[PDB]
Amino acid sequence: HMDPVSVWGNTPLATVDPEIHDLIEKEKRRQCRGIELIASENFTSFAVIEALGSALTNKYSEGMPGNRYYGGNEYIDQIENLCRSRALQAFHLDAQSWGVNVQPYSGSPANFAAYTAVLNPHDRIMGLDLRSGGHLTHGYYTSGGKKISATSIYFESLPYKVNSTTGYIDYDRLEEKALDFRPKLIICGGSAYPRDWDYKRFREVADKCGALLLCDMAHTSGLVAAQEVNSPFEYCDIVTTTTHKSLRGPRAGMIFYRKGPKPPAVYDFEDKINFAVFPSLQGGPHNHQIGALAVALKQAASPGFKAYAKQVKANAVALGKYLMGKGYSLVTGGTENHLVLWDLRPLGLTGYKVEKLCDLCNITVNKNAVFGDSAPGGVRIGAPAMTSRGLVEKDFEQIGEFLHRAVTLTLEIQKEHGKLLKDFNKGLVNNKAIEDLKADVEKFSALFDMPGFLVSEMKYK
Amino acid sequence: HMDPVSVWGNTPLATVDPEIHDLIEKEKRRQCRGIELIASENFTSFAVIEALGSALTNKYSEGMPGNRYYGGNEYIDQIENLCRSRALQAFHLDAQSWGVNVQPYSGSPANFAAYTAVLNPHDRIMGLDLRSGGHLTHGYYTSGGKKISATSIYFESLPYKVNSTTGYIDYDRLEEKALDFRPKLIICGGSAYPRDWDYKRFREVADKCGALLLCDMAHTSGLVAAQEVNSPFEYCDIVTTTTHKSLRGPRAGMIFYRKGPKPPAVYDFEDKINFAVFPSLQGGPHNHQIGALAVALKQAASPGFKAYAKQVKANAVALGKYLMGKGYSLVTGGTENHLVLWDLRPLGLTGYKVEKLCDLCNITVNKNAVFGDSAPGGVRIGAPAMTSRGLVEKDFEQIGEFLHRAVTLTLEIQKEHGKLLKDFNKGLVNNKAIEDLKADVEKFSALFDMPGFLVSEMKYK
Amino acid sequence: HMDPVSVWGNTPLATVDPEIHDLIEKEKRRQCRGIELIASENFTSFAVIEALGSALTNKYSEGMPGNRYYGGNEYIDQIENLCRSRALQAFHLDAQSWGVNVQPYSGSPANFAAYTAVLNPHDRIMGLDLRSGGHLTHGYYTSGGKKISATSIYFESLPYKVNSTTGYIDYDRLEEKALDFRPKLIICGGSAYPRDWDYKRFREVADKCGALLLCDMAHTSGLVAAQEVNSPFEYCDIVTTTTHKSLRGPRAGMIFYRKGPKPPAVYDFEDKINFAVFPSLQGGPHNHQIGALAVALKQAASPGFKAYAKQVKANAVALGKYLMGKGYSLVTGGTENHLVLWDLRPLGLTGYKVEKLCDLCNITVNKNAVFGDSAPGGVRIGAPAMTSRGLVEKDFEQIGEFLHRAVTLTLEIQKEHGKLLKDFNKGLVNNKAIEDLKADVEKFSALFDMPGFLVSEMKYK
Amino acid sequence: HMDPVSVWGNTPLATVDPEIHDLIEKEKRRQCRGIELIASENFTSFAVIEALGSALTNKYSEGMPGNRYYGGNEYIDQIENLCRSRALQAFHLDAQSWGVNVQPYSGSPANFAAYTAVLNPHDRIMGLDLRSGGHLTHGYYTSGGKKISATSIYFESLPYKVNSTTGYIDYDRLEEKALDFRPKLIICGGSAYPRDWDYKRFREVADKCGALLLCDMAHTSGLVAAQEVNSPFEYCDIVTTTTHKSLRGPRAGMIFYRKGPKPPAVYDFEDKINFAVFPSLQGGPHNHQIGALAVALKQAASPGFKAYAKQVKANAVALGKYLMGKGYSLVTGGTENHLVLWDLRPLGLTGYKVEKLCDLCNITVNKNAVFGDSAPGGVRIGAPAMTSRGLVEKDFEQIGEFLHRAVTLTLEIQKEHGKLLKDFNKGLVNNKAIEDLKADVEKFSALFDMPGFLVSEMKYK
Numbered sequence A, B, C, D: 001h002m003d004p005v006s007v008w009g010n011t012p013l014a015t016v017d018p019e020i021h022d023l024i025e026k027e028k029r030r031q032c033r034g035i036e037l038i039a040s041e042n043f044t045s046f047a048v049i050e051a052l053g054s055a056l057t058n059k060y061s062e063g064m065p066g067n068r069y070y071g072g073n074e075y076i077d078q079i080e081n082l083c084r085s086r087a088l089q090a091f092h093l094d095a096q097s098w099g100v101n102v103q104p105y106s107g108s109p110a111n112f113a114a115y116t117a118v119l120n121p122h123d124r125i126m127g128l129d130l131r132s133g134g135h136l137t138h139g140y141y142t143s144g145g146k147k148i149s150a151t152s153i154y155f156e157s158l159p160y161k162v163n164s165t166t167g168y169i170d171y172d173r174l175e176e177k178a179l180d181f182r183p184k185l186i187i188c189g190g191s192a193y194p195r196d197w198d199y200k201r202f203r204e205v206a207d208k209c210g211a212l213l214l215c216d217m218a219h220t221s222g223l224v225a226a227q228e229v230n231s232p233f234e235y236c237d238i239v240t241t242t243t244h245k246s247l248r249g250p251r252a253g254m255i256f257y258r259k260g261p262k263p264p265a266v267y268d269f270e271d272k273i274n275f276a277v278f279p280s281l282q283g284g285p286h287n288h289q290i291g292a293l294a295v296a297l298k299q300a301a302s303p304g305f306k307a308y309a310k311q312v313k314a315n316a317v318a319l320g321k322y323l324m325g326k327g328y329s330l331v332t333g334g335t336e337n338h339l340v341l342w343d344l345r346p347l348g349l350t351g352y353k354v355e356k357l358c359d360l361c362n363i364t365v366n367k368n369a370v371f372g373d374s375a376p377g378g379v380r381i382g383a384p385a386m387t388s389r390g391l392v393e394k395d396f397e398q399i400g401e402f403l404h405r406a407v408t409l410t411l412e413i414q415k416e417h418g419k420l421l422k423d424f425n426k427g428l429v430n431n432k433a434i435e436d437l438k439a440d441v442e443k444f445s446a447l448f449d450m451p452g453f454l455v456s457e458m459k460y461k
């Protein structure tokens, strides 16, 4: 006997799977009972979530709008076309000069799809070094030669670094490397770089060594959409990105590519990039993701989002100024985007130690490498998540006070117990000073609203 | 001025984005107002959709449960661990002998992650030929040498075909190729193969040529979970799959791998496959997909799903017997799984011609290559989608009657106008016989229930 | 104190290095005191040896004639231009349609230089299987996947085989493989194939799969120059060869390439092949080799050489007919070129066993694989070497009598001692029946003249 | 009718091929009627030439001594074994710690055979930049990305350069590159570097980045054998070389490799390198070259050669001091080996201009790139060739006087006519000052003896 559709197919989640429903409720509480400062995280809208969780997940639409393998894509084509036309207008792109593919399952697939389109296997790539604030998908191998990233497995990568004293990108060392290594593709953008990017200088370097210029604006896509940072579309041939970070959308990827006549002969990125996504690398697109993304791109083009992105920068600046006013060191001594990079080596601490104690106070940050590392000696702190909950400068200055108290309690424990990780941990068990900070954090966290779900109806406190 | 969280973050989709909401509603109507026979499609449960569209999309959990880069994954780890333990028990796998990774964004990423883990670039791969019913990600290049699939771009592929008269896999020609070509990996499983797979014979071939044996059970994962077809876990080293087809879950991928002591020395797939998914190829996992997948795997282990998979096989058989009783030819003359492959060359027709007229009657099938093609000459028809709506043998025999009438009207149009596409199309405009079939289809379609959403609350008719 | 030029630089070899001079004298005696039947060996002229051992070894002439890096190549250019113009006329090639590069250090470098010119790394190549009578540089890997040949290391190779019963090339199986594997280059020619090649059929196959057609005529270059076998220049794009085999020249290589307009648009092999030899792969050319080769190409274009090549075929035929008249089996039951392939499996023997006993009678042959091998079960016997010493059919029929007696004594030893290699060897020590054959061989060998050096002045008997 | 062996095989070269014999005679005159200063050239002994031009060219000996495919190698094995034992003692190598393979056809094949043995395709290599005085086979691609050298085609190369002001190897920039690029092999040695190599520093860099260390001592092999320069065997894992330069032997190659226990576990280079030479890359060895090489290695181990190598260094120093005493600039301001690198940019001249006028005075040098080039602006002048003819410091100081007059006439011509090549050439036609230098050169050249052949018996003046 088969179960009727009503029993298995229409019954709500809370009845079909109590375990998963209960676990999702605890995650919802965890997301609003603490302080989330992961620079790559955000809280998306309930409207995006509704499109994400819809019947759009049932449709196979292999191919592109108007050129699908299967029939019955009358509305999938309208949703995708709306999504890519919104993607272009959200970043103020003329359709005669720019095209976009909104089918990458995520940012990492978007980057590897861009590589396949414009490069052959073992072609040379240059990207920002991980320790300097770069990303894996830009190329990464260890000191022993172990090719960690797939970019360094199927292509030959070589990283350019920041100045080992100022923390800024060494554009003179970048040009020197690009002329020796002769990369076929140069990647700009990063995950923990607290300054803006000189895309015009990257263009001069790229032109000098005959390389294509790609920008991975994943972290700052929201700021780019609101024109709160430099636009890579003015100088790069290809722009890839995620959509779930500062853009505040679903987990997905996009690949922007130049179209039309080349500057002082027509660009031919469109077909290569479309073909790389499908049929080369990916199968059917996740239409529910594309529907949710179309919602996020319309929200990203609204005046409220421009104020949000402007607030994100002001909150990261206010947090950084508050930390430096307490004697703490920041890489480059400030920020021009959504995050600050906090150098903890001058304090005799490591990123892990501060990250672990902050997690025990429901303050979510991540240990991060700082220029001149040897054991990451810094923490990366981002503003988008809490800014999406309505926090402004005064609230972020209160976040700096919590971080101030967190590192102060981290030093007192290291002083009492030692600089040995094993010795350090012994000072966190039953520590009543942490529990008073955890409580001030939760109470401060619970004074703000939360997008995506209604707190009034959530199952846990 | 920033928009308050209530305005942008808590407002429902129907108000934030009327366009996308309206388009999703029409897709919902399209999904239940017609007859969906795409063998790779299904209608997932509302419980899966609720987990899919949740706050689980806000969390970055790069890494593995218990081995994450970031903190605050207390409940994400529980959701993922529950998902992998449910994946093992859904396929009756001993945890000491099998492991699974549930982070692949989709089926295509799962396969390429499996390749990266066990193979080096340019390693040789063998998979079922596309024209013989294989998949792109198993390897595909054109006759001009143009490497279409990424599997044939970063690896060296060579396809094995079916017997050009029986339509069955030529296992003697497979062994001959595997001994000449000496592949490092042999892939079994396909997208349009209507018979079961002799995994024991594939093991003999793999052992003879010293190759790893992988099975892509994407299409028949639901049947494998219910033990309605041969289990590849008894003879394959790695088993990859999608989760949104016969498994009736969300759009995602899984990679099963052997662990523990080797048969007549311990398997070492676990770390390679996990490392290939992250940090090599993918970034943060889509936790909402994993939550939705964990729900689907519990539904897949229920007695109702076991009856569903048995019904899928009975419906495809009943549909095939009905088509052969009307004089239509099927590849291999029947089916042992969820689909039938309908050879239309004996009728003087092409798959496209039949697919186009069926699309106008809201009958969704896909043109498909048939063994001995030179313009695909067949159509692939699947049972999972309509079977999930409660259709049984009698209903699928009525579906064959609709297909019978559809091809009968396709021959009458070709007879009157010709084999010229322009002339053929001319016979579909204002054709009243099609409108009588479409009307008979919709009315027949509207007599069944629908999973994922409640039809009583939908916006369109 | 430096040694004067007279002491170190002008003193003959017999005084400077007694060891090496004495060893060269013993090699000279070994070359004329026995019967040399290695199909790839020959005895070159004293004129070739004089040019080989000349002051031409002192000059660096990197580049091509008229486009050298260094000066002082006034006469090197004249020698090389004369060498390549003689190479074209020796093979009856119109200079408007064919070009040649005479700088490959040997045949193996010539083949790999041709590959580099027309192929990118990992491009697919097809060549005659080693066991079917092919060559390493055409591609070879073991059954375990060990890439033996550099052709299979830097390119992807796949061998085509002969019919496992007739011993002829399976052109239908060749076409089948070329259409599945889609090689970018197809290689014809071999080392132990006793029949001619259907180059027109190779052209049809190459055209069908869109591949370039190369012929490695190393073994039969002398027969091609005298037009005693099929000419590959009528159907192949590139022809590579050694010059020290049937061509009877020095150890070197040549690469012939098509020039001018393509048949029913102009060929562009010239610059790629010239560039691949230098500066890509090789350094300075061995001018002494090129001078010696120019001598050999003039000798190859003389009427005496055409009679020699015609005699080589007649001697190999007479030897084969004599062996088959004694009940011995030959692959394909005869020969159309310079060698016979003697299948010893019907006798219960292996090639090694016959080769070892023949070497003890100063009869030089080589064990060779025969179609359908599992321990090579055949011996390869060639005619050029002894034919260059003036032997005709009657003498080669006497060689068959010696081979007849050699295998008869090989069977008597296997009968008395056993089919175990260890047991077999025990029957060769102090065996007086071998010593009577060795003596008849030396006495028969010493009844003919020898090129390259004067036997009257040689140091040993 | 076949030609008897006496007619074609025993007739001397002067009768069989008058053209080639006449051209070889003119080359002999050219070699002794002028001044040869190509740093890569030398005049080998008549004993080497006699072994080079012998019956040793008739024998196929594929494999290794004692492990041959064919029989009848009793004396070829003795010649090769003597050659490898002489190679080891010529460079004072303990046979338990070092092995050598003497089958590379030339230096370029020796290097690529070493790469294949220890590296996989696309493995990273670092070598001295071509403009800084490196060699093609160490890696070379143009600024457009065009991979010129085969080393940069089948492997990924990156060159290290000299200091752009001192002209010395920048070992700090070498270590920086090796730690960024992470090469699997580092190559030391060059073609136009006038100083010695700090192999101990290369070992520190190699050990720091986990790379193998190879030295291409081709140019200075004679000086290494006489211990007149630093020995790379003390710090390198593999040492490759030519044998026809300062070693004063035939055109061939050798690959030295470490064996036995590793320094503070046993080296495994022996089998890989031997297998790479055969059967991977090369076919049958050129036994005549190995015989000639064995002769040269015995001459290289004689006290006369030790004095020769000491004289080569003294002559290059005396020539360099004479040029600097006339106000000419040398890279690094001197020399520690066999050559000087003459910077002509301070004179307003190019290397080509000086090379062309020197070629018209029968002074053979080569234009060469100098550190900081943008049209090579220097000339490379070597001492081995003329030193082998008995020239000492006083004679090389007279060579500098000729070079002084040559460049003085080059400036006088540039002054009168201009820096336009057409105008410059116009000053060399009927120029009586050049004819007075040519006459002074020939008469000076004809006052010295010549190795390889007896001048008393030569056909031309």
Ligand SMILES: Cc1ncc(COP(=O)(O)O)c(CNCC(=O)O)c1O
Pocket: A060, A282, A283, A284, A285, B039, B040, B106, B107, B108, B109, B135, B137, B189, B190, B191, B216, B217, B218, B219, B242, B251, B252
């Ligand atoms: C056998 C098989 N394996 C993997 C995949 C990849 O699934 P994704 O779309 O998630 O990449 C497919 C797609 N099947 C498409 C079809 O049969 O119509 C497939 O058929």
Ligand SMILES: Cc1ncc(COP(=O)(O)O)c(CNCC(=O)O)c1O
Pocket: A040, A106, A107, A108, A109, A135, A137, A189, A190, A191, A216, A217, A218, A219, A242, A251, A252, B060, B282, B283, B284, B285
């Ligand atoms: C700059 C950048 N680009 C691409 C990606 C890939 O996104 P996916 O995880 O969806 O594949 C990331 C992930 N950034 C992760 C972090 O910084 O925390 C990223 O930081």
Ligand SMILES: Cc1ncc(COP(=O)(O)O)c(CNCC(=O)O)c1O
Pocket: C060, C282, C283, C284, C285, D039, D040, D106, D107, D108, D109, D135, D137, D189, D190, D191, D216, D217, D218, D219, D242, D251, D252
């Ligand atoms: C340092 C070095 N190594 C290897 C080679 C290769 O030698 P072959 O020509 O045998 O391939 C050369 C050529 N030296 C050329 C020159 O300096 O003029 C070389 O200079």
Ligand SMILES: Cc1ncc(COP(=O)(O)O)c(CNCC(=O)O)c1O
Pocket: C040, C106, C107, C108, C109, C135, C137, C189, C190, C191, C216, C217, C218, C219, C242, C251, C252, D060, D282, D283, D284, D285
């Ligand atoms: C057909 C063929 N082509 C090329 C070569 C290479 O020649 P070199 O050894 O000079 O590299 C050989 C060697 N033939 C060896 C044999 O059959 O005995 C050959 O047989």
